Amino acid sequence: ANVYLTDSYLKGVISFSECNALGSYIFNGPYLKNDYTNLISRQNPLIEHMNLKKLNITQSLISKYHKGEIKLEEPTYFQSLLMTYKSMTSSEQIATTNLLKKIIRRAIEISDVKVYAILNKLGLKEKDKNQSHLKADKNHSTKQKDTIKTTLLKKLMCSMQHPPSWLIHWFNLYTKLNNILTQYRSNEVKNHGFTLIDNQTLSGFQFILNQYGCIVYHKELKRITVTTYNQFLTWKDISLSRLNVCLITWISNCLNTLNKSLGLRCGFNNVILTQLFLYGDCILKLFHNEGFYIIKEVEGFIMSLILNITEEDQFRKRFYNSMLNNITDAANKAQKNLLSRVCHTLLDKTVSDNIINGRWIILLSKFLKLIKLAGDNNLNNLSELYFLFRIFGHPMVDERQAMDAVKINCNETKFYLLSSLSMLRGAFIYRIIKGFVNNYNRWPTLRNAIVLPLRWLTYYKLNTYPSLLELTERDLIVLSGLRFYREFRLPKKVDLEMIINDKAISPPKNLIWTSFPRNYMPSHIQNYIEHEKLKFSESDKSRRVLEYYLRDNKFNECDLYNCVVNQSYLNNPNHVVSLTGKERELSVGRMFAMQPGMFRQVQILAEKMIAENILQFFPESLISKCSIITDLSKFNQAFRYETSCICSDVLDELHGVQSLFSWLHLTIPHVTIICTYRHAPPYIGDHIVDLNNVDEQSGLYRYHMGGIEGWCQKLWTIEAISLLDLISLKGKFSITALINGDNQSIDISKPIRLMEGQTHAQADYLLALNSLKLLYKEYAGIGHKLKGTETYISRDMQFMSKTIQHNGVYYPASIKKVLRVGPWINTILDDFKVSLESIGSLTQELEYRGESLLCSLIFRNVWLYNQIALQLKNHALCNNKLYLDILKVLKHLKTFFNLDNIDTALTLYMNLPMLFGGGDPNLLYRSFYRRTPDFLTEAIVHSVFILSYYTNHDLKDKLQDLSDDRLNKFLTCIITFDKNPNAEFVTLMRDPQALGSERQAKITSEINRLAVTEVLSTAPNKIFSKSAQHYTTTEIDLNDIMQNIEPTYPHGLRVVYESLPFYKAEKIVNLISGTKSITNILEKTSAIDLTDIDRATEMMRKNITLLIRILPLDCNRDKREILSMENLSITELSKYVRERSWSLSNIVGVTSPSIMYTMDIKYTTSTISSGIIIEKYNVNSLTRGERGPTKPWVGSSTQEKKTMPVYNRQVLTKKQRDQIDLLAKLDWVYASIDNKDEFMEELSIGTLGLTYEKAKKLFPQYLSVNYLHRLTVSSRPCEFPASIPAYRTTNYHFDTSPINRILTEKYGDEDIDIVFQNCISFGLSLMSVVEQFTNVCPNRIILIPKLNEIHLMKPPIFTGDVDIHKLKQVIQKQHMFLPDKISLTQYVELFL
Amino acid sequence: NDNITARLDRIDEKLSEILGMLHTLVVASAGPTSARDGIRDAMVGLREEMIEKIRTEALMTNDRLEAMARLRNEESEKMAKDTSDEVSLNPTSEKLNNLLEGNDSDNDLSLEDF
Amino acid sequence: NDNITARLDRIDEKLSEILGMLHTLVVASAGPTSARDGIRDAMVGLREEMIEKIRTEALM
Amino acid sequence: NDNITARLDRIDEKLSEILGMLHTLVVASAGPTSARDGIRDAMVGLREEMIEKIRTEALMTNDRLEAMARLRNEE
Amino acid sequence: NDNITARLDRIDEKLSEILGMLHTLVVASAGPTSARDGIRDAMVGLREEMIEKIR
């Protein structure tokens, strides 16, 4: 017996053939579309549908339908009904209103601690600058003042007491659908194969719900429908999205009523939003399933409404009209397609008369006018109005009809003129030559140098290239004929990391019939399946990749590099590319493809070689002016062999291989492209056992001859940029291109200002028109016809990365981002820590972009309090264990301190950080800056600030006297504890920031590592088997290696860890350690094992209860000596904790001081006038949303200076250069070690083929003496940005000399601990938050450091020696992950 | 010098003829034949017989009217309509435009009606 | 003799154009059809890598 | 002076052969039914020319690699 | 002169090259039924020739 945990959110695609195959059986007639599915379903019904119909209540429904008392319906109709939940009694509405008032009052109270701490540390207690009526109450004011200490929130809490109706509406929809879902999930985890029958939860409806299908019945309107489980998940998600929108707008409106700057920048009247949603559902009901075409194409309306505000007249009208025409064309296509589809089926009467009559235009007009009104001629409202794209459900996508159009478009004949292809290839080779010259100061080697004019031989003899403006057209054809010698070598050993992934792959051709259920396939096909299953190996008859590599019996490391050169992938007998409808977007769009495993290897290899070598040559790929924006979907299919392979042959030739990058067009035309969804089987006829004889249908076709979406995208980016170069050559305008793979942006400049004709604009308009003519002509001459639907011309407006920027100002679409934020968001097996982390991250993203703090704060605490208090009881695996444990923790915190009630304990629990087992997802610094080198100091400063709420403190300095010793008790209980260190060095290597000694909670990978190791030990693959069996002792050797050395530097240990061939094994393991299914992969069942659930719930209970272990109340009389509050440098405390936890003598270079605690805020200049000064150069009242003079500021940490040797790095692999750099860092950091020569000898001989001395010629030697201050590892933070968006930082200016004066007079001209970037970053964020709270931005701000916590730092001297024998053993035990050895021929051709 | 320059000019005449002949070529993409059972190889021919084949439908193509006009270097109808001062609206689009402007609240539209 | 060199340079450049255009035609002429018969390696040539492989089999 | 003219006559005959090859190519690839029926069923000595061109190309490819390996052995 | 003979030789090389390209084109396109086996048989023959020449 195994459980089946189900999804809580969509996480997938809604299906069409599923609904069809269910309804056709239940109602014994074609339900959605006449197709082969109905025949094959009625003839051979599936099991689970047989069970669903076998029930008695659905049989009563069928009997009531046959008589004709109820009429069938479309799922979208019931979506429209459920949304307009008119049936609401008074008592349930009262209950929900009380519940919402409770959730609100509790969520406002939790954030009070953080707001109070901020307002203290800021010193902004002064000059802070229905509500009055319910403020002036006696008892209500007392009940508020019981636990709220900031007037800024007293006013807000009083103002938010009476919520509006629509909020309550969406709230109760959410809670009821959520209750149905969670009840089903729990009862399913308990008893398997359970169907939920409900008719009293949602008043008036009736659900027969199950994992395999759902049936909804409404008696008073006597309608019935059949849907899938995903559809019900989607209805829940729609309700949730609308709830979130309403909550956010509610909070923002109240806050903005308080002050103009607090809330978000957007205003909305929720009545308009509700009418808007309702009209959307109305359209969706009118056009049953084709309404999503209309709703998609509506997207142009908002772009036009913005161009009305940001563009001149001509482009304005042009875009307006094109968009209108596209909308109406979409509507007509939808209507005709619906009438064609539903012509002969059960739902033939449901088509409304308003479609035929022609009166849907008035409805569509009203909807568009409501959008226009909700915009209300503002750039903000219009920018954040994009969420409408998300609210309504995702369409039911059908597989078959999605391919046929692509078939019609794909296989055809294209004609090109020879000059076109020739000049394209000429531009390509020009780009490659320019890249080589500007990179290596060397021209690539050629074999056909004879064919070259003298004017070009003089360019070859001297290593330089001609510029672009001088170059002509005809010369390109001259440059079309050349050949190259090998320049880039090919990696020989397969890299196991990039290739392994959880995504699925299709079975080989001869076996593909095992994707369709046993019932649907006919008799003889099943007989052939059974008779042939044995011929193939156990490896390739695998559904996924993890299995495919975990079952390779004959798996050779040189197999791939032998195969890519022996050309075994061409003319292959079993090759089939199967399209599955799992691509997820609002339009039907496309559906993505899957090959067998081997070809997937080859394709990944091609893309990897390009990304490593070539894409470095085209940096574009990630005064009359005109920008042109082009959609680049459907750009793939137009490609043919010639157009792509002429340019691909150059890369193929450079790499020395034959037909590597040209595989796609060389083998795809032969193979049979079929659709493989479980419920969509193609009619097979009889006596046909393989695909190459099946007769073509609506399902499968052949002779593609065109790119398949997604594969080899880099080739098409490259060739597009080359073609664009050619265009610039013919048109004579300075061009620039930006291709991200989804939208191509081409900007044009031409020097014909001061030469204008009697107008300063409307000449660039003619430039636009002429350039667009030339571009249409060019792309059409290449063979890809460009439609007027994709491209559009603009001058001052550019949509980039779906972000709107105008006049150098950014406009953020936050509400879209935080749209779905719920109880178990982003979880795997219903975690608690991960859920809290994800909620914190999404809401902090709101605060970073939307430019509002208090809104994000209250909105985060709402859902945090929800998941903690209300919905923690109802949990899948464990019934009440987590609630009991959190109640224990709350009672414990109540006893430890002097908190009055469990409620106040919940407050102080929701404010404590997660490092100490608290509930605060994201610390108090993340508001002010983004990165920091160490966490523990920030945890301690945060907890100090939080505890400063209950105990009164100044926070300007350390108060000598504390009457209430809560903070001091907390500190003395955090410093004093026992020591239990085990495996300290390997742990300090994997995570350099770790504490250990059981003072911090353990994450899932560390727990599951042993189980994954054991199950990997029994794997038919020799590689994984050996490296899993030997996995335990290597940890011991790694622990003992760096043990002797006395001074311990963690990051240095990290480099030692990365250089050794154990990093890749750990990666491959803790990759698998993330999936919910472990110990069960080899048995190929989706269900999980129970012992995994047990370990998960045990670790959850322990991580929850951790706070007692960290903060025990027993050590009050055990140790009554409490530390004083006189000086109390917190960096010393953090160093003490990190050292005692591991019991080491001294750990150096890992504790940077907390900049929030260090600096102090001050406005009036003094005689000192020290510390960094930040002043704004613009003079305004409020700078929010107004750009300033200066360039932006991104904090860039100080680099490391190194001298590179002289040699040709071209003939070398990526991993080898990486390893040489790592070994260089080691030579730099371990000069003081005594075994140096022997230790480096062993390392260089093990990782590389070279001996040390020769190897030393390649090591880039570092010139910086201090590596503590300057080093580069994946563990250290690389840049230190600010919270506020980039554009706002331009408005200020920072001067850092006055602090440098004192920092240089005392401890002069030496490196100091504090990192300087975060100082000015915190300054900028501080300016912004002050502007939000006081509403008047300060003129100048000054930051004075605290002269205590700024410690020294000097490059230490190491003592002790390393263990070389165990190091050699480590490198010997796991040799498969070693990077390739530098052969002798390679090293001899190096120096030339 | 008469003889050497005469030979040189004959050389250049033949050579420019060859160059023009090459610039004239058109090459057709690979594809499947009618009654598709195999792939026909890519064939290259002079323009004229190619356009003749396009005209007499010897090769399956989606659109033929644009191809012949494009090979004849002339700008077709669509292209001009694609690059103009303004785009001619549709009739139904004209109805939408007239219903968008003139907000006289004459919709008399009931949400329950729709 | 000046006109001799000038006319020879004209002929040289035009020959180079002819040769480049014919080369691109040769390349784009391989196609998915010739890959069925294995003639592709014939038209586009033999690159370094595989030949080196052959050399390995020559020595053992 | 006269050898110059002899070389120009050699060039003339070569370019005439090239022009004939161009005509043959275009008419052969243009011929609707001249590909299968009315085929040349010939050009066997041209195959040897193409294979020997590939032979010389393969030797030119192989000669440069052998310099590198012999330099490896000596150094 | 020297320039004249040098440039005549270079033009002769270009002529040889274009002749080879025209040859491979006109032989590859004409007949499928013969080339399909002739060219790959000659290619495996060239492979054997390389093996024996290095040997």
Author numbering:
A (entry chain A): 10 to 138, 167 to 659, 692 to 1461
B (entry chain E): 128 to 241
C (entry chain B): 128 to 187
D (entry chain D): 128 to 202
E (entry chain C): 128 to 182
Quote from the publication.
A total of 2600 movies gave rise to the final 3.67 Å map, refined with 253,372 particles selected from multiple rounds of 2D and 3D classifications. The final atomic model contains the RdRp domain (blue) and the Cap domain (green) of the RSV L protein, and the oligomerization domain (POD, red) and C-terminal domain (PCTD, orange) of tetrameric P proteins (representative model fitting with the map). We have assigned residues to domains as follows: RdRp, 1-945; Cap, 946-1461; POD, 128-157; PCTD, 158-241. The RdRp domain adopts a conventional “fingers-palm-thumb” right-hand fold as many other RNA and DNA polymerases. POD is fully assembled into a four-helix bundle as expected. However, the 3.67 Å cryo-EM map revealed no extra density for the connector domain (CD), the MT domain and the C-terminal domain (CTD) of L as well as the N-terminal domain (NTD) of P. We speculate that the missing density of L is due to significant structural rearrangements of L, and the missing density of P is primarily due to the intrinsic flexibility of P. The interactions between L and a tetrameric P can be divided into three parts: (1) two of four-helix bundles of POD and the RdRp; (2) two flexible PCTD chains wrap around the surface of RdRp and stabilize the base of the tetrameric POD; (3) one flexible PCTD chain extends to the positively charged “palm” motif of RdRp and the edge of the putative NTP entrance channel. Interestingly, four chains of PCTD adopt four different conformations and interact broadly with the RdRp domain of L. However, the nonsymmetric structures of PCTD suggest that P likely plays a nonsymmetric structural role more than previously appreciated.
RSV initiates viral infection by delivering into the host cell a virus-specific RNA synthesis machine required for both genome replication and gene transcription. The catalytic core is a 250 kDa large (L) protein that catalyzes the RNA polymerization in both replication and transcription, the cap addition, and cap methylation of nascent viral mRNAs. A tetrameric phosphoprotein (P) is essential to modulate and constitute an active RNA polymerase with L4,5. Here, we characterize the structure of the RSV polymerase (L:P) using cryo-electron microscopy (cryo-EM).
